[PDB]
Amino acid sequence: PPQPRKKRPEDFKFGKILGEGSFSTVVLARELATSREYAIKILEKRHIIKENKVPYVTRERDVMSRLDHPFFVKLYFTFQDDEKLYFGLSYAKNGELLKYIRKIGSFDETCTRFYTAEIVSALEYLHGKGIIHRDLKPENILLNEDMHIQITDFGTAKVLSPESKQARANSFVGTAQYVSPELLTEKSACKSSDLWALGCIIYQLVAGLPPFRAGNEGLIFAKIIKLEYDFPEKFFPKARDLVEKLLVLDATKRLGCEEMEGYGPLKAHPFFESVTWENLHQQTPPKLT
Ligand SMILES: Nc1ncnc2c1ncn2[C@@H]1O[C@H](COP(=O)(O)OP(=O)(O)OP(=O)(O)O)[C@@H](O)[C@H]1O
Numbered sequence: 371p372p373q374p375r376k377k378r379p380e381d382f383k384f385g386k387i388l389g390e391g392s393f394s395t396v397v398l399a400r401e402l403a404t405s406r407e408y409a410i411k412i413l414e415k416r417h418i419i420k421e422n423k424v425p426y427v428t429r430e431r432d433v434m435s436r437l438d439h440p441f442f443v444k445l446y447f448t449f450q451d452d453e454k455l456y457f458g459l460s461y462a463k464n465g466e467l468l469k470y471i472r473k474i475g476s477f478d479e480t481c482t483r484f485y486t487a488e489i490v491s492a493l494e495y496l497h498g499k500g501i502i503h504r505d506l507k508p509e510n511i512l513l514n515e516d517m518h519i520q521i522t523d524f525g526t527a528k529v530l531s532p533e534s535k536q537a538r539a540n541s542f543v544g545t546a547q548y549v550s551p552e553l554l555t556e557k558s559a560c561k562s563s564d565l566w567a568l569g570c571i572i573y574q575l576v577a578g579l580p581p582f583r584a585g586n587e588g589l590i591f592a593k594i595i596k597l598e599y600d601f602p603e604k605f606f607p608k609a610r611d612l613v614e615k616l617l618v619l620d621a622t623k624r625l626g627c628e629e630m631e632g633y634g635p636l637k638a639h640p641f642f643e644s645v646t647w648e649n650l651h652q653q654t655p656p657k658l659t
């Protein structure tokens with residue numbers, strides 16, 4: 371069918387900068403005709419052309435256009451003018467999960483469980499569509515007005531080809547603290563690489579910092595491939611067990627991966643015993659304190 375009229379910059383009143391990326395800026399904007407607020411990601415054409423970033427922009431648009439699930443930032447529209455590309459995104463009013471980890475220091479068990487469950491639910495959806503995120507981290511897990519998660523940053527995601535039953539992706543992307551050992555050693559990532567990142571994130575929610583810590587990337591890489599980390603005291607025992615079943619060097623042995631028979635066993639883990647999985651995005655999140 372036809373679609374709505376293509377939008378233009380003059381259709382919006384732009385407000386504050388929400389954040390700045392290496393080759394993008396996200397600005398809060400109100401659509402004049404509706405009074406709706408959007409986070410509009412803006413890229414300068416000559417800059418991403420000069421700096422060979424066009425593939426990432428195309429990737430972000432293509433991957434986001436495939437998503438239809440409440441735990442992801444939504445791509446509503448795109449438009450361009452002579453100088454710029456514009457992505458109209460849902461506005462995640464409460465910002466990055468990382469902000470809350472820093473502020474509060476350590477999530478309690480109820481909050482760790484709830485937010486872990488939402489991330490697991492989101493990954494189940496993404497992996498079911500054959501998509502690897504590859505840069506899952508608290509900075510990329512935003513929070514909407516109701517404090518549900520909104521995962522973002524899909525420019526470095528990968529749609530695995532169904533036609534070839536593709537399992538491995540060859541682009542080297544990610545963030546050192548959360549990068550999987552297989553990417554470092556085998557030079558490819560798989561869906562299970564996101565489960566490794568999940569393990570790091572669960573650890574971080576409880577411990578306050580992610581498990582592989584150092585002042586530079588190479589030192590972090592060295593720890594990752596040796597599985598060199600420890601748990602702080604008082605780390606919730608069932609959460610520790612879960613993390614130990616995710617932070618596994620062999621990607622085929624991580625709870626939740628295809629070779630471990632998928633998300634059923636992961637959702638069945640004792641840490642999640644009280645979770646109602648079916649309708650998390652309609653549940654009231656526990657207050658973060
Ligand atoms: N949909 C959104 N709603 C609210 N805030 C957002 C949204 N998308 C991004 N932001 C904020 O804007 C910041 C900049 O995002 P952008 O994707 O342009 O760069 P980045 O991913 O932070 O940086 P880099 O691309 O260099 O890794 C984000 O870190 C986030 O805090």
Ligand SMILES: O=S(=O)(Nc1nc2ccc(Cl)cc2s1)c1cc2ccccc2s1
Pocket residue numbers: 414415416417418419424427428431448449450455456457
């Ligand atoms: O189909 S696209 O891949 N075409 C593109 N045209 C350009 C032009 C200049 C630059 Cl720097 C990148 C792209 S890429 C595309 C359009 C668009 C608009 C807004 C947000 C993302 C994208 S991707």
